Ligand binder design. Structure first.
Ligand SMILES: [Rb+]
Ligand SMILES: [Rb+]
Lengths: 66, 66
DNA sequence: CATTTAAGACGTCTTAAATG
DNA sequence: CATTTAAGACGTCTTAAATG
């Protein structure tokens, strides 16, 4: 059921920051955040690692849940 | 500095496996492993994580090293 | 034989416009 | 306004051929 992009957005909403603010922490645009959250694309390896740090969770959690 | 792909190859050689056998463990072709090792491309998010498990090191070690 | 090169399909980013 | 859509450049894969 649950997609990675849904967990990315839940974790960003928990921080209460905008897509642009998260993009800035990660080193990508607000649009890349948006594409990830909507499961349009998935983050590449370097961006997944930066995202999981900004989000304070592990890459595995983002990728596969729990 | 040392590139991620040289770290991938050094770790694979430690394990004494061919690129095809690593590929099998990760879920990609031997060519993808060749591409990564030669820094032609970098693994995407899901592949980087699968690669790090198959190699028993962390995603951060692969991407950034010590 | 193991690995690299090549070509090409599809994925992951970018900025600007549109939407709500 | 924040976000999503659009258009488009370069990135990541696959198989087949070439290389050694
Ligand atoms: Rb408007
Ligand atoms: Rb408007």
């Amino acid at each position: 059921t649950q997609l990675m992009g849904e967990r990315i957005r839940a974790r960003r909403k928990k921080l209460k920051i905008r897509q642009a603010a998260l993009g800035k922490m990660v080193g990508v645009s607000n649009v890349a955040i948006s594409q990830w959250e909507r499961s349009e694309t998935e983050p590449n390896g370097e961006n997944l690692l930066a995202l999981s740090k900004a989000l304070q969770c592990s890459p595995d959690y983002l990728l596969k849940g729990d």
